[PDB]
Structure formats: structure tokens, C-alpha cells
Write a protein that binds this ligand. Sequence first.
Ligand SMILES: [Cl-]
Ligand SMILES: [Fe+2]
Ligand SMILES: [Fe+2]
Ligand SMILES: [Fe+2]
Ligand SMILES: [Fe+2]
Ligand SMILES: [Fe+2]
Ligand SMILES: [Fe+2]
Ligand SMILES: [Fe+2]
Ligand SMILES: [Fe+2]
Ligand SMILES: [Fe+2]
Ligand SMILES: [Fe+2]
Ligand SMILES: [Fe+2]
Ligand SMILES: [Fe+2]
Ligand SMILES: [Fe+2]
Ligand SMILES: [Fe+2]
Ligand SMILES: [Fe+2]
Ligand SMILES: [Fe+2]
Ligand SMILES: [Fe+2]
Ligand SMILES: [Fe+2]
Ligand SMILES: [Fe+2]
Ligand SMILES: [Fe+2]
Ligand SMILES: [Fe+2]
Ligand SMILES: [Fe+2]
Ligand SMILES: [Fe+2]
Ligand SMILES: [Fe+2]
Ligand SMILES: [Fe+2]
Ligand SMILES: [Fe+2]
Ligand SMILES: [Fe+2]
Ligand SMILES: [Fe+2]
Ligand SMILES: [Fe+2]
Ligand SMILES: [Fe+2]
Ligand SMILES: [Fe+2]
Ligand SMILES: [Fe+2]
Ligand SMILES: [Fe+2]
Ligand SMILES: [Fe+2]
Ligand SMILES: [Fe+2]
Ligand SMILES: [Fe+2]
Ligand SMILES: [Fe+2]
Ligand SMILES: [Fe+2]
Ligand SMILES: [Fe+2]
Ligand SMILES: [Fe+2]
Ligand SMILES: [Fe+2]
Lengths: 173, 173, 173, 173, 173, 173
Amino acid sequence: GPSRVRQNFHPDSEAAINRQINLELYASYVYLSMAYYFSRDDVALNNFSRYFLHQSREETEHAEKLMRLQNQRGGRIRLQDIKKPEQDDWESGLHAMECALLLEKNVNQSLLELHALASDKGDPHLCDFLETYYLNEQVKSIKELGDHVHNLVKMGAPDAGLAEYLFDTHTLG
Amino acid sequence: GPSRVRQNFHPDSEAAINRQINLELYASYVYLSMAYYFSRDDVALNNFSRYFLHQSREETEHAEKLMRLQNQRGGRIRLQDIKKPEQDDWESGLHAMECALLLEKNVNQSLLELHALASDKGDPHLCDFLETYYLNEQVKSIKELGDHVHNLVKMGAPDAGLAEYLFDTHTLG
Amino acid sequence: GPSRVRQNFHPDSEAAINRQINLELYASYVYLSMAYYFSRDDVALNNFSRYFLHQSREETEHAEKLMRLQNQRGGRIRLQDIKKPEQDDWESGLHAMECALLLEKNVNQSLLELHALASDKGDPHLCDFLETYYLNEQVKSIKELGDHVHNLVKMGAPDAGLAEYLFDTHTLG
Amino acid sequence: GPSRVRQNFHPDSEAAINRQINLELYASYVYLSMAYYFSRDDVALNNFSRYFLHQSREETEHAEKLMRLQNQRGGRIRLQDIKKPEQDDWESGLHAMECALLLEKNVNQSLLELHALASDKGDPHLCDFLETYYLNEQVKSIKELGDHVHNLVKMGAPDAGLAEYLFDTHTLG
Amino acid sequence: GPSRVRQNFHPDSEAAINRQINLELYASYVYLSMAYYFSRDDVALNNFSRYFLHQSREETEHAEKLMRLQNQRGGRIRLQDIKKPEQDDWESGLHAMECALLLEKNVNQSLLELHALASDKGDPHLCDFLETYYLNEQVKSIKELGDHVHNLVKMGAPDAGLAEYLFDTHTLG
Amino acid sequence: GPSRVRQNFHPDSEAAINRQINLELYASYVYLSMAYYFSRDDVALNNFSRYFLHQSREETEHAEKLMRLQNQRGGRIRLQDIKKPEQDDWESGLHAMECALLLEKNVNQSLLELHALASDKGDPHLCDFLETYYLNEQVKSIKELGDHVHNLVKMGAPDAGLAEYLFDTHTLG
Ligand SMILES: [Cl-]
Ligand SMILES: [Fe+2]
Ligand SMILES: [Fe+2]
Ligand SMILES: [Fe+2]
Ligand SMILES: [Fe+2]
Ligand SMILES: [Fe+2]
Ligand SMILES: [Fe+2]
Ligand SMILES: [Fe+2]
Ligand SMILES: [Fe+2]
Ligand SMILES: [Fe+2]
Ligand SMILES: [Fe+2]
Ligand SMILES: [Fe+2]
Ligand SMILES: [Fe+2]
Ligand SMILES: [Fe+2]
Ligand SMILES: [Fe+2]
Ligand SMILES: [Fe+2]
Ligand SMILES: [Fe+2]
Ligand SMILES: [Fe+2]
Ligand SMILES: [Fe+2]
Ligand SMILES: [Fe+2]
Ligand SMILES: [Fe+2]
Ligand SMILES: [Fe+2]
Ligand SMILES: [Fe+2]
Ligand SMILES: [Fe+2]
Ligand SMILES: [Fe+2]
Ligand SMILES: [Fe+2]
Ligand SMILES: [Fe+2]
Ligand SMILES: [Fe+2]
Ligand SMILES: [Fe+2]
Ligand SMILES: [Fe+2]
Ligand SMILES: [Fe+2]
Ligand SMILES: [Fe+2]
Ligand SMILES: [Fe+2]
Ligand SMILES: [Fe+2]
Ligand SMILES: [Fe+2]
Ligand SMILES: [Fe+2]
Ligand SMILES: [Fe+2]
Ligand SMILES: [Fe+2]
Ligand SMILES: [Fe+2]
Ligand SMILES: [Fe+2]
Ligand SMILES: [Fe+2]
Ligand SMILES: [Fe+2]
């Protein structure tokens, strides 16, 4: 106190990074919930399931990279409860994809606020870290999810009987 | 009489194993009937056919493993007639899948009764045999069949013209 | 009704093919019974066992090929109960081999009657099918079984202590 | 309601499986916390860190396997908040290893209670599942952790300056 | 005292495991005695010898696996004298095979009693351990030995001059 | 009686070889006891454990080679009980190594007495056998154990906290 490594690292930045770690862990848990929704016997869309499981693991990688940043900069990780997701029953392939898009946008908004704080505190290491590993990948995620929602809507999901089935097998497969 | 190998093997267990052999053979025959239904010129769903043929051969393996158990434990195999299946015309892909699910549940109920008898007779070898090779594989079968029924129902089988065709080619293919 | 494929296919032929399917399934079951007789702890002739198990699976292939014929020609498969074999205890290697020879001759007689019916109905496709895949293989089976019975008799089976043991290990091995 | 797959699956078992999923997720989070403790600049035991990170990921696999069980049996996954770990600062290599041992014993106690419930409800599938994938691996974990605690204590951790360093490099390396 | 690893491990179970270790070591020694009987100049059945030597080493593996279990569960191994086998002269191939069958049945009875104790003490880890590694392999051993005794008896051992010689070379070879 | 192979083989030599077989078996059992001491949760020196297990198996090879000698020369193996080791708790790495050194010296003394008897009976085959396979390997064993005791003593075992740990990992590893 301070860490022998710490330099140009504002306590506000340290706290905002702890908040972002919790949000990334929360996103992981939402996607895990979605993944196991799709392997229910009364849903059975295995490629939706694999899709969301892959998203869940990516979100864990995002959290861990922020944990490593906290250690590298000499901050102290403070973990909080990971809240359960808003739903256990995600209703349909389309509904899950829309919820995921909203979640990604919300996480993006949090990262942009983190970048604005980093800029305000004159922390270019932290600004570069967010630009290099977070902002770019959030834009790509939001765009992929938007594509998926569009196709599902057009195909007539969730009511058209063939739509989620064909999308599972041809886009997510 | 007794076999020089026989030990801790109740005559009731021996008889219940003979009953289970007949039931597994019967399941084999039901699936064989289903397999050749699907290769009729007026049905022509070749991947449904291959699916059920594969199930038929698995059921024979289940029967033979119980026959080997009877020999290993010093019991005497007693074969009975294998009754013909309830239908020759299985009506549709969905109807066959629903019949198969009911059959698997009925076989599962028989295996659970066998396990309860084995437990009542303090035969842990026989309990372990059922747990190791039967109970797990029945749960997986029932869950796969449930998935298949769900997708076919959702896709609009049997009346929707594309449903069984697309399921044949994309799930069972 | 009729099938759009059906041509030059007499209802009598269709019914006789259904009878032959049942007989081939029955032969399969007789050989399965024999196979598991030989792996009893008080018989223990593992190569007799493998021999009969191989015969059992061949008989299933014979049945399925007739089922496929029924579908190809536009007939409708009608399955019946598969009767249990005449014995559970097949007494000796020699006795089983003699029973198998009698069974093969009985199946051969049924196939020859099927060929005579096919000829009477001017169905050369069906005559050729039987000649190509059945008649030749039945002659070879009957001759192999006759060879086996001869050697076992000469060696002094079933009473000579070394005969079935040595035949198991040197002919069937 | 009920699921078309559900059979011999007691609502009490379904609820106890949901509780176990939460506990396995909690164990994952405790080990993640431990992993990033060890990569602090003022702790810097990289092999302790890798050790606990590996434990964290194993605990996630345990949770997911129970989620899959819930789906296979026709139960409905109900997720709850994942509570934060008891400490952010785990004090020493030895202290973390002692906390992990206590955690593993607590999880083991929960699994044994689950097995007793499964037995009481005559669910042998569920009993076998726990025996096959959980009970054995918990015993091995507890024994490994006990070995580690013993060696660290004997070597004079945490006060002896070389102990955690040498253990990091020679046992965990 | 107690071990830091010990959990749900009854002192009665610990003592019964020590008794089983001694019995497995004793079985090893009986088979070692048998192995070197068969390589006497006045017996000279080298494949009987290799057979029993292989059995001896398997029995040591069984003992060591129970020793490892004792350590894993936090019990304390207590070794006792290994009694010498009942005979130094095992009389014939058939007589040794009959003695081995009796020994295997006696060990099986001891394992079944251990399982009943484990069940009575609500130790499912210990029940699963016995089912997974012991009960199955004892049934297979007893059945193999029964097969061997049957063939030797039928062939006319021990008085028929060719019987043990031919069995040595064709079954055990 | 005598064996048709027996020549220049004194009954005293035959009896002393039986005594040596028992002693080698006893040494095997002492080392087995030591091996499983080191894998206790409260000892946990896995390389000490592997070391002693390797010694145990070597001692069995020594016993079997003497059994083969007895058969080759036309003597008759007479087995006796294998006494349990003097301790179940071997106290420390150093204490076990000192006990092993004493055991090896005691076995060496027995082999030297056997050689003196062989010489007195003018049995050069037996003298050469002991020189070729026993005396040389005992000297090497005693010297290795002496080296190990020296290093452990110098390093400050058993009280110095790092000594047995470092020796486990660097000498025995
Ligand atoms: Cl021969
Ligand atoms: Fe992604
Ligand atoms: Fe990634
Ligand atoms: Fe990725
Ligand atoms: Fe993220
Ligand atoms: Fe809440
Ligand atoms: Fe994301
Ligand atoms: Fe910038
Ligand atoms: Fe299957
Ligand atoms: Fe299979
Ligand atoms: Fe399969
Ligand atoms: Fe089955
Ligand atoms: Fe009927
Ligand atoms: Fe089945
Ligand atoms: Fe059980
Ligand atoms: Fe099991
Ligand atoms: Fe397609
Ligand atoms: Fe054949
Ligand atoms: Fe064939
Ligand atoms: Fe063939
Ligand atoms: Fe045939
Ligand atoms: Fe009948
Ligand atoms: Fe035939
Ligand atoms: Fe022809
Ligand atoms: Fe682990
Ligand atoms: Fe794993
Ligand atoms: Fe692992
Ligand atoms: Fe776990
Ligand atoms: Fe809290
Ligand atoms: Fe764990
Ligand atoms: Fe064996
Ligand atoms: Fe083995
Ligand atoms: Fe083996
Ligand atoms: Fe054993
Ligand atoms: Fe005695
Ligand atoms: Fe055994
Ligand atoms: Fe050595
Ligand atoms: Fe050696
Ligand atoms: Fe060696
Ligand atoms: Fe030795
Ligand atoms: Fe004593
Ligand atoms: Fe030695």
C-alpha cells in the first residue's frame, strides 16, 4: 500500500475495473443459462446450445483478462456475488438472441464509460487495453447478434415451425 | 445344480433376467419393423430407416449381454417366443418416434424393477451390472427420442409436407 | 394399393416371402440359443459358441435381404411371432451340429418351394434372387455341417472325452 | 409438465440437484479468487495460481455435468446467485490449501446427502451418476489437498522463507 | 487422529479393509505356490505355471489397490502375517484348478460381506469402489475357473494321460 | 524321490534355500509396508513411496529365482508364513532408510551363510548361483542405502523441515 508496481493508476479506475469484472462474470452466467435452455428435451436446438456455451466461455476469458490487468497494475481484485440471470426459460431461439444483443449493448456501454473514466484520469495504458481487447470485440459481437436476430425475424421465428430448426442447422451449424 | 460357479444368485433374479432378455429381443424386433417401414416406396425416409436399424442392433447387443450375465453367474437361459410388434404400418416418422419413446420408457421401468429386485436380494454384482450398462444408456435413449419428437412436432409433422423430409436429411443424416 | 412400383408380383409370392422372413428369423434365434449354450460354465466350448453366433448373424442378414426384396417389389412386410427354439439345452457339440443340419435342410426345402412358386407365377426376378443369394449358400451350409457331423462322429463325440474339445480347438478355431 | 422424458425422478431430487449446481459454481468462484491471489505482485507464486485456476475449471465441469443430468432426466434447471468467496486475500499458500480442503469436504458432505436422498427415493440412475463421476473424484481431491497441507506444514509454511517458494517450484511445478 | 482427510469412514470399514488386504495377499501366495508346483521336473506343465503366476500378480494388484484406498480415505493400514498355502504339492492340474475356484469363491464371499458392511455404514464411495474394481472381476474369475474345471473333468483329468498335457498346450497356451 | 534331475544337491542346501525364499518374501513385505507408509496423507513423500515399492518388487524377483533354482536342482519348495513387518508406522524417511539398510545387511549375512554351506557341501553350481545373482546385488543395495542415510543425516532429517522433502524430489525423483 501502495503496491511496489503501482503507477499512474487511479483508485477510481481500480474500482471501475472491479465492477467490469463482475459484469463480465454475469454475462458468462447468462450465456450458460441460455446454453442449457437449448438442450432441454422440449427445445432441443443443439447448435443454439453450443453457440451460447461458446459465448459463456468467451465472457469468462474477458473477466480473467481484467483480473490479470488488476494484478499487473497493482490494484486489488474485489469480487462480488454473481447475480442469477433474469430468466430460466428463454422462450425461443429468437428471444434468447434478442436478450443477448441487449446484454452485449449494455456491456458495451459499461466499457465505453470505463474508457471515458480512463481518459479523464490520463491513463493511456488502460485506454489502450480497452481498445485493444474489448471495444473491437464488442462491436463484432453486437453485429453478429444483430445479423442473427434479423435472419430469425425474417424466417418467421418463433412461430414458423421450420425457422429456428433450419437456422440451428444452417447458420449455427 | 447348482452350477459350480453359482454364488449369491437368487432364483428370482435368474427368472427376472430371463424376462428382460425377452423384452430386449422384443425391442430389437420392433425397431427392425420400424426400419423396414421407412424404406417402403411410399414412405422413403432412408435416414429414419438407418436410425431404427441401428437401434435394432443395439437392442440385440443388450439382450446378448444379459445372456452372457446369465452364463457368468451360473443361471440357465430360458428363451420364449419373441412377439411380433404391435403395428406393421408405423404411420409416420413422428408416430414411430413416439412409439419408440414409449417402448424405451417401458423397458426402463422393467430395468428399474430388476434393480429393485437385485437390491432386495442383496446382489450388488447384479445392481452394478444394471447401473453400468443399462440404466445410463436408457436415460440417454429416452432423452434423444424426446428431443426428436419435440423437433418433429414443432416442425409440423406429420402433415407439413417438408417436416419429416427435412428432419430425415438434417438431423438423422 | 397397388404400390406404384409393383409389377409382375403375385400376392401368393408376397405371402410366401413373408413366411420365409419368419423362418430365417427363427433360424437366427435357434443359432443364438446354441451359441449361448456353448458358453455355459458346464459346457465351455468357446469356438462352438463363436461358430453358432456367426451363423445367427448370417440368418439375420438372410431375413433382412428378403425384407428389402419385399419393399423393392412393392409388397408389404407382415411380421409374425418368432417361436422359441425346440431346446434350451442342446446336449453336446455333435447334437447341436445335427440339429443345425436338420434346420438348414428344412430351410432349404422352404426355399425350393418358394422357387417353384416363383416359377409357377412366371416371376424370373424372384427366381434369380433365390438362386443368386439363397440356394447356393444353403448348399454350402448343409455341406459344411455334414462335414462337421462326420468328423465329430468319427472322433467319438459326444462320449469320447477329447473329441469335442479337440474339434473346438482345431476345426472351429 | 411432466416432461415427456421424465421417469422415476422425484421433485426433491430435482431440487437437490439445483442446490448442488449452485455449490459447484460457488466452488469454481472460490478457486478463481485463489488463482488470482497468487499472481499478485506481492505473492507471485505462479504455480499455486495455475493449480487453483485448474481446480476452478474442473468445478465448472462438475456444475455443467449436473446441468446436463437435469436436462437428461427432464428436470428444470433453476439458477441462483453465486455468492462471492469468503476472502479476497487468502493470506498464504498454506492458508489457501487449508481453505480448499475444507471446501472440498463441505462439497463432499453435500454429495453424500444427495446420494442418501437418491437412495431414499429409489433412484439408482442418480445414485450411479454420483458414484461414477463425483464421489471418487472428491476423495482423490481431498487426499491431494491433505498431502499438500502436510508438506507445507512440515516445510514450515507460511513463515519459513523458502517453504512456499520451494513447494511452488517442485510440487506444483 | 482423525486424519485431516477422513470423512464418512467408519472404523469397522477400516478394519474390514485391513482384513481384505490380508486375504488378497494370501491369495497371491497360494497362486505363487501353484505356479512353482507346475514347473517341477515331475509335473512340467509350463502353461499351467504361467497361468497361476499371472493370477498371483493380479492378486497383488488387488491388495495394493485396497492399500491405496485405505490411504485415500485416511485409514491406517495394519498388516498381518501372510499364512502359507494349505498344500505344497497341488497333486494335478485339475486339483489346482478346483482349489483356485474354491479360493475365488471364498474371496468373493468376503467381498460381498465387505459390501454389506459398507452399505450398512452408508459409505457409497466404498460400495462403488468394490463394485467397480472387485465384484465384476471376481465373477469373471470364478466363471473362467469353472470353464477350466469342466473341460479338464470332461477330458478325463487327472488320470487320462493326454488330458492335462493337451489342455496346457491348447487352452492355457 | 530322488527327483530324476537331482545331482550333487545336499538336503541341507535344499533346506537352506527354502529358508532364504522365506526371507526374501519377508523383505518384499517390509518394503511394501514402507511404500504405503510414504503415501499416507500425513507423510506424502511420493518418491520415497515409489522407491520402496520398486525395492519390494525386486525382492519378489529374488524369491522367485530361488524357487526356480529349487525346481531346476530337483529340490522341493516348502513355503512358510510370511511374518508381518516389525512396524506399521515407519516414523520418517530417514528411519525407513536405516531400517532398510539393517534389513539388507541381515539378508546379506544369510546369503553368506548359504554360500559357506554350499562350499562346505562342494556344490559349485549353488556357489556360482549366489555369486552371480545375489552377492553382487546385495553389496550394491547396501551401498546405495548407506549413501541415502548419509545424505539424509547431513541434511538434518528428520527434524529439519526441508530435508526429506528436498531429498524426495532431488535424489529419489
Ligand atoms: Cl492336438
Ligand atoms: Fe463471440
Ligand atoms: Fe477467446
Ligand atoms: Fe471465439
Ligand atoms: Fe464480455
Ligand atoms: Fe436477486
Ligand atoms: Fe460479450
Ligand atoms: Fe487513444
Ligand atoms: Fe441408441
Ligand atoms: Fe452398442
Ligand atoms: Fe451406437
Ligand atoms: Fe435395450
Ligand atoms: Fe399374438
Ligand atoms: Fe432401448
Ligand atoms: Fe449402489
Ligand atoms: Fe457403479
Ligand atoms: Fe439444408
Ligand atoms: Fe455360414
Ligand atoms: Fe454374410
Ligand atoms: Fe460369413
Ligand atoms: Fe438362412
Ligand atoms: Fe410355443
Ligand atoms: Fe441357414
Ligand atoms: Fe442366375
Ligand atoms: Fe482437481
Ligand atoms: Fe476434468
Ligand atoms: Fe484435471
Ligand atoms: Fe466439484
Ligand atoms: Fe453477501
Ligand atoms: Fe472440488
Ligand atoms: Fe485373472
Ligand atoms: Fe491387472
Ligand atoms: Fe490380467
Ligand atoms: Fe483378488
Ligand atoms: Fe500355520
Ligand atoms: Fe482372485
Ligand atoms: Fe534395488
Ligand atoms: Fe530386477
Ligand atoms: Fe531395478
Ligand atoms: Fe533380496
Ligand atoms: Fe507375530
Ligand atoms: Fe534386498
